[PDB]
Design a binder for these strands. Structure first.
Ligand SMILES: [Mg+2]
Ligand SMILES: [Mg+2]
Ligand SMILES: [Mg+2]
Ligand SMILES: [Mg+2]
Ligand SMILES: [Mg+2]
Ligand SMILES: [Mg+2]
Ligand SMILES: [Mg+2]
Ligand SMILES: [Mg+2]
Ligand SMILES: [Mg+2]
Ligand SMILES: [Mg+2]
Ligand SMILES: [Mg+2]
Ligand SMILES: [Mg+2]
Ligand SMILES: [Mg+2]
Ligand SMILES: [Mg+2]
Ligand SMILES: [Mg+2]
Ligand SMILES: [Mg+2]
Ligand SMILES: [Mg+2]
Ligand SMILES: [Mg+2]
Ligand SMILES: [Zn+2]
Lengths: 37, 148, 108, 292, 166, 153, 308
RNA sequence: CACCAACUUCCUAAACUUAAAUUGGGUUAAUCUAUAACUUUAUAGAUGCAACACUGUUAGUAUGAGUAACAAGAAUUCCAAU
């Protein structure tokens, strides 16, 4: 993760990990509205 | 006139088409004079075309108000709250029908300069460029001239 | 030499609102202890001074009547006495000016 | 914990205020007459137990408000923010009066109280600081004196020059806040409850209560800090401009409990001193002061 | 001519509800046809802007300008009507919220010159307006600290966007 | 470049300056308290002090009489100078005149004004600036400092 | 008014304390000055020998006036009298912290009152233990010649036969025209000149359509720092600390001047035979005569000069 | 061994091919009248029918400019006084 200070950068890196653990990454598959079913 | 006017970004009212498409026009009002030359074309629109337009667009409520009137006027109201008013004074039937269709197709978003022809909330999939992308790392993270 | 162009209000507003042309605020204004009116620190109170001179004019007016004419100044010291006062031994041989009013408290 | 004492003491202080404020129902008008040399004969029609001498000054002009430190209600010194109680004649005292004896005492007492407030919060919460008394010293003495008893752990530590400089920094912080000197006349019982923990304060309250026919005792508050007072105090802490905590001297006969006297000097905004004059006075304020 | 400044003292607000801050009183006063230049009067009106009533009077009493006495007299009248008619409790509890000068109706006369030539002189009049607001003068202006200046600079950096692209 | 010059330029010229000053001096001797513009009163103060010195020289002095004759246009004042003012100021070596600034003139020229008088006159006392009493806060602290220094050597 | 007010030192002093304060301040000036009389007994900084290329500290003196001076050859020399009054070293900056090439010393003279001074200046002197001085000037001094701050400097620093440089502010003449400021000729008085007698002529040429920077025009003259180079020292008075300097010195009488050894190439190394750091009366190896003379000077009380 | 560069040309949509006196043609602002319309409209008939500019006319207000310039002998006990 990036940050203005080392503590801020480390804190941001913690969020980058949690996003990739809960499968909420920015490039995750888009939500599916296609189904008529 | 670009710097003398406002501008905005490309947008949709409520993510109009993501799940289902909703028509933004919700109400049309037509004011007529029963006997007035200028309202003739609007009168013919009511006789011939208003009923078909209403059936094609069942989500728009159409109000037709014949009353003593100097100029016929069309008022269009949208779901976002925008209101547009059009003078129909002495227009042919076709022009009024053509104009009425334009109101149905439009959204209430202001017609002003749009900065970009494209809007996306996910511009990147592989990561936005930053100065360290395409820079190789160094052993022990030693910056240049650092002795260690 | 005559102006080559009209001067805009934007330029003029900068000239006549420059700090150099503004009225300076004064820090030397104080209130008088005796009269309670305003004064400057280095200047005599105008209210109190106003009392003194108007009493002085009354005294000088009485002096004019006694002399009665020009070129009648005494060659001896002068003294002012108010109703209820009599010359003392030290006051002997001095011109006495008599005032109808009582001795002012501030005047001694 | 010390923070708890401030909270509980403040609560009792506020409770008494509301009780006395509620005690007076409706509005009753008292006629108070200006007896001062300036603007003579003015009569202020004030409300009983609510309006204060500062409110009377507000009617006249801002000069009265800025320059008046004390008021003479029926010949007795009154705090500018102490609510008036009955019809009377009022006169306002300033620092530059021909004989400002009463004003000098009030300024001296208030500055001593401000010394007590700084001392309490200066030390670490680990140590226990107990305020014993603020001796009444003449202004001629050259400094105002506050007596304090520190913890036995610091029984032989003496503040250095930087430590004393630190104390003045807190005092200047108090001045910048511009805190009004709140006033309460309260009966022994409540005063004892607010000061039950401090044995020194308790006995002082007993003395100052026996003195009066009733049990009324004067209480003053600066912000959270509260203290007993010998008499009227300054309206606000913004009056002080020059402030110094000169020195601390150990009272030699204090083996049972080491009492350390805190000394300092102050001057109001109205009477500022030049740089050199202030230094010379400060030096003479670093010498022991004996109450006489 | 318009005379709206005088009318402003006739506005009546509805009774305030118990749970609301007390509304400060406002008093509007003016003197219209003053034989004095508005350009000259601006400086006197400018100086007292924001000051308290007593502070404004003290400065005006020791100014040598003709307009100072005119402004002082208007200020005293405004003070009296504030307490007398507008339910202001303390005379001293007032400050100058607004003070400005305006043009009056002027008269045209002849300025004689050397060779039978003339010029059009103006006999100038001016108006003076004040609003007195109950309460202490609003706190003076506080300059930005260095940290405040730095904070604004960083916000500008953080607001940067990639321009003319997706 | 008017460095070192000890006079104001007043009136229609050097002679007019003397006559304007002489008229003020004549009024001062007669009434003992005079109002003039602050600059003119300051200009005349030096002459007022020196005139008393000539009066002290004595009645019989020829130079003093000529000086008194020139400066006092109203000739009844000359006996007053030698027999009233000079005897009064025998003890003093100087500082016979008291000059103080008065609030500016309310006459559309807003002149800076002063009051000049001879000390010891019979008129009501001027409202002079009175220094603070020793009982004030600052004075007492200084008084305490004075006592310690004096008593402790 | 809840507003700022102006104060001065006398505003709140009573008649009794008004005299006391003056005596108290005067007393402290004497105590502080006496405390600094003996520098050698107050941990003086190490004394170094003179070496070629050395520069000593200078003094600040007051300009007393002028008088005539005669030499054994009968020639008359107008001479200016410079008096050193309360000259002390105040501040030292090392070579690095001021200018890589050389170090600096600040020296002040002419004790002044403490009543109308900024607190910052008073704070500076309080730590130094001295009464305030009217003027501060900076002297470039080599490392070996550095002197501890608080050290008194005396007129015997300089010696007769030594050339010196004096710098001071020139007499201020106010706004002046081109004739007096720059010696412009002007225009003829008669023969039809219409309101042009003391005016500048043409400012420049028409081709450039502007006025060159630095063009000589009417403006304020005088009141500028100027230096006079190569003035001999004829005699020094030890009792009153008076230096006799050849010729004229910039400024008016009673004005402070800066005096330092001459920087002219001919007098490149004159400090060889002078008190190298400075002259210390505390040492008093030999008490100096009241007046020191240059050899050529004809002393008063000598026999009349006969050119035999 | 190329790239960049003009609405040149292509491309989506369209368009159908170039100083200025002069010449041909289609509309239109305003007001009145006829007949209507009835929050200011239609078809006809008319005209003192449209102004960023004539050192244009009248009025207003700026600029230069709060600039150039203008004015009362002194004190007092007071302007039909000393
Ligand atoms: Mg004329
Ligand atoms: Mg004009
Ligand atoms: Mg001069
Ligand atoms: Mg010569
Ligand atoms: Mg000059
Ligand atoms: Mg010539
Ligand atoms: Mg000529
Ligand atoms: Mg050019
Ligand atoms: Mg093309
Ligand atoms: Mg026309
Ligand atoms: Mg037009
Ligand atoms: Mg032209
Ligand atoms: Mg035109
Ligand atoms: Mg103008
Ligand atoms: Mg000009
Ligand atoms: Mg000019
Ligand atoms: Mg002029
Ligand atoms: Mg005249
Ligand atoms: Zn007064």
């Amino acid at each position: 993760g990036p940050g203005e200070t080392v503590l801020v950068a480390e804190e941001e890196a913690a969020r980058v990990a949690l996003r990739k653990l809960y499968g909420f990454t920015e490039n995750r598959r888009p939500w599916d509205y296609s189904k008529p079913k | 006139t670009g710097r003398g006017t406002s501008s905005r970004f490309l947008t949709s009212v409520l993510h109009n088409g993501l799940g289902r498409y909703v028509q933004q026009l919700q109400r049309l009002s037509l004011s007529l004079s029963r006997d007035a030359p200028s309202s003739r074309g609007a009168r013919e629109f009511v006789e011939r075309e208003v009923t078909d337009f209403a059936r094609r667009n069942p989500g728009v409520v159409v109000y037709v108000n014949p009353r003593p009137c100097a100029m016929p006027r069309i008022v269009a109201e949208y779901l976002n709250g925008a209101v547009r008013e059009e003078n129909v004074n002495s227009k042919s039937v076709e022009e009024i029908k053509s104009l009425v269709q334009k109101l149905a197709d439009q959204s209430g978003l202001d017609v002003i300069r749009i900065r970009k022809p494209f809007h996306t909330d996910n511009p990147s999939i592989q990561g936005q460029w930053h100065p360290f992308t395409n820079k190789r790392t160094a052993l022990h993270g030693l910056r240049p001239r650092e002795l260690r | 030499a005559a102006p080559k162009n009209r001067r805009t209000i934007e330029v003029n507003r900068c000239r006549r609102r420059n700090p150099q042309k503004l009225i300076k605020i004064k820090n030397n204004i104080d209130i008088c202890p005796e009269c309670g009116h305003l004064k400057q620190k280095h200047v005599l109170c105008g209210y109190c001074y106003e009392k003194v001179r108007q009493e002085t004019t009354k005294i000088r007016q009485q002096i004019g009547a006694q002399e009665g004419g020009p070129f009648r100044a005494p060659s001896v010291e002068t003294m002012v006495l108010y109703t209820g006062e009599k010359p003392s031994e030290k006051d002997q041989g001095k011109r006495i000016v008599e005032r109808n009013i009582k001795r002012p408290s501030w005047f001694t | 914990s010390p923070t708890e004492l401030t909270e509980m003491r403040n609560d009792l202080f506020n409770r008494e205020k509301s009780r006395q404020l509620s005690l007076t129902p409706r509005t009753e008008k008292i006629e108070v007459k200006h007896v001062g040399k300036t603007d003579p004969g003015t009569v202020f029609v004030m409300n009983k137990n609510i309006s204060t001498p500062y409110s009377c000054a507000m009617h006249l002009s801002e000069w009265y408000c800025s320059k008046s430190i004390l008021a003479l209600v029926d010949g007795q010194p009154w705090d500018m923010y102490k609510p008036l109680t009955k019809s009377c004649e009022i006169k306002f005292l300033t620092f530059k009066d021909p004989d400002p004896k009463e004003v000098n005492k009030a300024y001296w007492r208030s500055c001593a109280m401000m010394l007590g407030c700084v001392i309490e919060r200066a030390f670490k919460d680990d140590y226990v600081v107990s305020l014993v008394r603020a001796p009444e010293v003449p202004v001629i003495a050259g400094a105002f004196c506050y007596d304090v008893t520190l913890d036995k752990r610091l029984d032989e530590w003496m503040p250095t020059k930087e430590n004393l400089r630190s104390f003045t920094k807190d005092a200047h912080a108090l001045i910048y806040r511009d805190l009004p000197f709140e006033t309460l006349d309260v009966d022994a019982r409540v005063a004892l409850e607010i000061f039950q923990h401090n044995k020194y304060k308790v006995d002082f309250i007993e003395e100052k209560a026996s003195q009066n026919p009733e049990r009324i005792v004067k209480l003053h508050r600066i912000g959270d800090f509260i203290d007993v007072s010998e008499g009227p105090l300054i309206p606000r802490t913004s009056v002080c401009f020059q402030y110094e905590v000169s020195a601390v001297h150990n009272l030699n006969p204090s083996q049972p409990n080491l009492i350390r006297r805190f000394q300092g000097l102050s001057l109001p905004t109205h009477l500022r001193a030049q740089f050199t004059i202030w230094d010379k006075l400060v030096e003479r304020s670093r010498k022991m002061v004996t109450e006489d | 001519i318009s005379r709206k400044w005088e009318k402003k003292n006739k506005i009546v607000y509805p009774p305030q509800l118990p749970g609301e801050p007390r509304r400060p009183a406002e008093i509007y006063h003016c003197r219209r046809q003053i034989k004095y230049s508005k350009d000259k009067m601006w400086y006197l009106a400018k100086m007292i802007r924001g000051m308290s009533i007593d502070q404004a009077l003290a400065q005006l009493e020791f100014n040598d300008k003709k307009g100072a006495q005119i402004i002082k007299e208007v200020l005293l009248e405004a003070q009296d009507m504030a307490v007398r008619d507008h339910n202001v409790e303390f005379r001293s509890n007032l400050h100058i919220a607004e003070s400005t000068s305006g043009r009056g109706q002027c008269l045209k006369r002849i300025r004689y010159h050397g060779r039978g030539r003339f010029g059009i002189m103006e006999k100038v009049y001016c108006h003076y307006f004040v609003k007195l607001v109950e309460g202490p003068p609003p706190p003076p202006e506080v300059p930005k600290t260095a940290v405040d200046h730095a904070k604004d600079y960083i916000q500008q950096l953080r607001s940067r966007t990639i321009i003319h692209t997706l | 470049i008017s460095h070192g010059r000890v006079y104001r330029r007043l009136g229609l010229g050097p002679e007019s300056r003397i006559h304007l000053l002489r008229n003020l001096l004549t009024g001062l001797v007669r009434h003992e308290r005079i109002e003039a513009t602050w600059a003119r009163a300051d200009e005349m103060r030096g002459y007022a002090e020196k005139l008393i010195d000539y009066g002290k020289l004595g009645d019989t002095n020829e130079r003093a009489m000529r000086m008194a004759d020139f400066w006092l246009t109203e000739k009844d004042l000359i006996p007053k100078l030698f027999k009233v003012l000079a005897p009064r100021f025998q003890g003093q070596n100087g500082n016979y005149t008291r000059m103080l600034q008065i609030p500016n003139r309310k006459e559309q020229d807003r002149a800076k004004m002063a009051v000049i008088e001879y000390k010891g006159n019979y008129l009501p006392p001027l409202p002079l600036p009175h220094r603070d009493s020793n009982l004030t806060l600052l004075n007492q602290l200084l008084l305490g400092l004075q006592q310690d220094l004096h008593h402790n050597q | 008014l809840h507003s700022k007010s102006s104060t001065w030192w006398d505003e709140h002093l009573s008649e009794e304390n008004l005299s006391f304060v003056k005596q108290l301040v005067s007393d402290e000036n004497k105590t502080q000055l006496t405390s600094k009389l003996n520098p050698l007994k107050d941990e003086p900084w190490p004394l170094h020998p003179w070496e070629p290329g050395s520069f000593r500290v200078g003094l600040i003196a007051l300009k007393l006036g002028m008088m005539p001076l005669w030499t054994k050859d009968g020639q008359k020399h107008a001479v200016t009298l410079l008096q050193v009054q309360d000259c002390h070293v105040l501040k030292y900056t090392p070579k690095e912290d001021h200018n890589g090439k050389i170090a600096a010393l600040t020296v002040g003279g002419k004790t002044v009152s403490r009543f109308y001074k900024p607190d910052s200046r008073l704070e500076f002197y309080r730590d130094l233990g001295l009464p305030p001085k009217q003027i501060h000037k900076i002297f470039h001094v080599t490392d070996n010649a550095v002197i501890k701050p608080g050290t008194p400097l005396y007129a015997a620093h300089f010696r007769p036969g030594q050339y010196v440089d004096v710098t001071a502010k020139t007499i201020g003449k106010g706004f002046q025209g081109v004739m007096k400021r720059w010696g412009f000729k002007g225009q003829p008085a008669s023969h039809g000149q219409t309101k042009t007698h003391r005016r500048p002529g043409a400012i420049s040429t028409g081709d450039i359509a502007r006025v060159w920077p630095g063009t000589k025009m009417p403006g304020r003259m005088g009141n500028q720092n100027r230096t006079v180079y190569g003035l001999k020292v004829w005699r020094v008075n030890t009792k009153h600390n008076i230096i006799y300097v050849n010729g004229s010195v910039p400024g008016h009488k009673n004005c402070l001047v800066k005096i330092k050894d001459s920087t002219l190439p001919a007098y490149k190394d004159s400090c060889k035979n002078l008190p190298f750091p400075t002259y210390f009366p505390d040492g008093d190896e030999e008490e100096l005569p009241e007046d020191l003379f240059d050899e050529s000077v004809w002393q008063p009380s000598e026999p009349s000069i006969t050119f035999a």
